[PDB]
Amino acid sequence: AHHHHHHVAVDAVSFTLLQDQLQSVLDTLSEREAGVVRLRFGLTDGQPRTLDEIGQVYGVTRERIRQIESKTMSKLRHPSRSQVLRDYLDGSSGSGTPEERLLRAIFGE
Amino acid sequence: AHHHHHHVAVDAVSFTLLQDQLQSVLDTLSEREAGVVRLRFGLTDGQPRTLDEIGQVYGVTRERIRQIESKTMSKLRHPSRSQVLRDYLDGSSGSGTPEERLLRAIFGE
Amino acid sequence: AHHHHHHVAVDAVSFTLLQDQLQSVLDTLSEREAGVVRLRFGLTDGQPRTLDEIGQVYGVTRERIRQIESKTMSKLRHPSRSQVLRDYLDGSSGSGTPEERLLRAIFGE
Amino acid sequence: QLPGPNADIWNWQLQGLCRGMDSSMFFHPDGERGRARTQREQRAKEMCRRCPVIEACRSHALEVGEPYGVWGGLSESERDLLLKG
Amino acid sequence: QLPGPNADIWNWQLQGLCRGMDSSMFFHPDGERGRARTQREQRAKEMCRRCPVIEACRSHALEVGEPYGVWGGLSESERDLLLKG
Amino acid sequence: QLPGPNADIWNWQLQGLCRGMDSSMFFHPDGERGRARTQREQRAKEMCRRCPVIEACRSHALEVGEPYGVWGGLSESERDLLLKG
Ligand code: SF4
Ligand code: SF4
Ligand code: SF4
Ligand code: NI
Ligand code: NI
Ligand code: NI
Ligand code: NI
Ligand code: NI
Ligand code: NI
Ligand code: NI
């Protein structure tokens, strides 16, 4: 109900990535940008799509999908909204979760 | 069916906390104590409650809820039953899980 | 839908073990071998079975079940198919998952 | 170890004599008044007075702070009197 | 830190003046043409020209590479002209 | 590395010649008797006799212990005879 998460390592740094916090990241994108992300990386069904397959979905060229992807990555890293990304990438901390509050009560302060 | 768990870090120590082992911790409390814990930290629905909101649930004062919370924390740390807490906090070990038994069979001894 | 996983530590080495990758490991076994594994370690329902209980299931002796288990472990470690085991034991890497692809897009290269 | 002031409780709790018992010998049900209360406390204390880690238990409860329960052979009110007067 | 070339963006982004704002002040909707486009850019730039980390923002966008958005008080086309000519 | 005695198998298995094959060339179906059995073994062995890590495979099976399968160009019974007599 909130538990779905993934463990990943990229260049020997580890991440715990919560589905709910990914949804908060995607919510900052346009509907088409978020859909391109979901199709490109296989978030919808585990299966990545090619740029041409995604362009078929949205009625645009492969090159426009490439540009949509590029614009999305710039959007996700922009300082205006990049705290949502920071929160997602720091999922291993459990900050603001019921269990972290409980443990702080048990341990004091 | 047993997988729901949370990753949390408190003062740079990390924990893996299984919902089934949390249920075993709560089972050692009275029904009202366990309910206060669930409401206070948002285990029921992700949303913490104030002491006054919880007192409304149980028909008691905010101060009685504060005392119920305090008594609960003493109960959870008492040496009589604190092994259930130890087991919960050591969830990253996977001790007594099907997968840990399988891996010990594959690895030997 | 792919998230079910377990965290285990064996002799101070930690593993993240995905149910989908365990299924790929079991798929390389015979139906009876995979069933013996599931019953012996409690993968079906959290509850390990004795060798005699498993022999009752398959109509064979306790000693034949011991031999089936031994043969299974040799099969899982044989160099012919041991990449499926390697993939399972390396679940903490998240390699080939949607989230790892997404993070590599965000981070570059 | 654990974070916070309770960092080291596992150093001694594994030797406590009460380790198997239900928490009911050491904590009063919410409503309890009169005879029952005191009879619960003295039963708990008979165990503490046989326990090998009574000193560590007592020290944890008084110095780190446990407001509820019998710890170290001391009742809740005994500890409250010692600490606050 | 983060892996890859964006390893160090958190060093400066926490001081950016735009930190609370919707990304719409800094990125053009897909269809945008004429007046609207330029009026969006100059609004974004008025903020950058007040921002304490404008130099780090500009340097990230030009040297590490951000093809879209207003960064460091520079538009997309300004940066494309500087980098590719 | 892995825990236990199989700690180092990945050092050599990635070079094994059988790496792509179904385990059926190296393990007998449960019921197998007569001709089929031996014909399976000699096929597996023809591969081992071409394999670059045959020595490491053979050593793992005999010294660390693999009761089932063809390893290192040796059958199950060959290894059982060598180890137990
Ligand atoms: S002193 Fe009493 S409460 Fe403390 S561990 Fe010993 S028996 Fe338990
Ligand atoms: S320079 Fe502009 S885009 Fe960069 S952080 Fe400052 S206000 Fe935001
Ligand atoms: S010696 Fe035979 S069983 Fe061992 S890795 Fe080589 S081919 Fe495979
Ligand atoms: Ni959930
Ligand atoms: Ni939960
Ligand atoms: Ni589960
Ligand atoms: Ni499971
Ligand atoms: Ni996990
Ligand atoms: Ni899943
Ligand atoms: Ni997922």
Numbering used by the authors:
A (entry chain B), B (entry chain B), C (entry chain B): 439 to 547
D (entry chain A), E (entry chain A), F (entry chain A): 6 to 90
Direct quotes from the study:
WhiB3 plays a crucial role in the survival and pathogenesis of Mtb. It binds to the conserved region 4 of the principal sigma factor (σA4) in the RNA polymerase holoenzyme to regulate gene expression like other known Wbl proteins in Mtb. These structures reveal that the WhiB3:σA4 complex shares a molecular interface similar to other structurally characterized Wbl proteins and also possesses a subclass-specific Arg-rich DNA-binding motif.
The R3 structure contains one WhiB3:σA4-βtip complex per asymmetric unit, as the trimer axis coincides with the crystallographic threefold axis. The crystal structures of the WhiB3:σA4-βtip complex in the P43212 and R3 forms are essentially identical except for the N-terminal loop region, with an average Cα root-mean-square deviation of 0.27 Å for WhiB3 and 0.42 Å for σA4, respectively. The R3 structure was used for the following structural analysis of the WhiB3:σA4-βtip complex because of the better-defined electron density of the N-terminal residues (aa 6–13) in WhiB3. The buried surface area between WhiB3 and σA4-βtip (1075.3 Å2) is significantly larger than that of the WhiB1:σA4 complex (645 ± 27 Å2) and WhiB7:σA4-βtip complex (576 ± 3 Å2) (see Experimental procedures). The net increase in the surface contact between WhiB3 and σA4-βtip is mainly attributed to the N-terminal residues 6 to 16 of WhiB3, which has a buried surface area of 372.1 Å2 with σA4-βtip. In particular, L7, P8, I14, and W15 of WhiB3 form a hydrophobic core with both σA4 and βtip. The 4Fe-4S cluster binding pocket in WhiB3:σA4-βtip is enclosed, similar to that of WhiB1:σA4 and in contrast to the solvent-accessible cluster in the case of WhiB7:σA4-βtip.
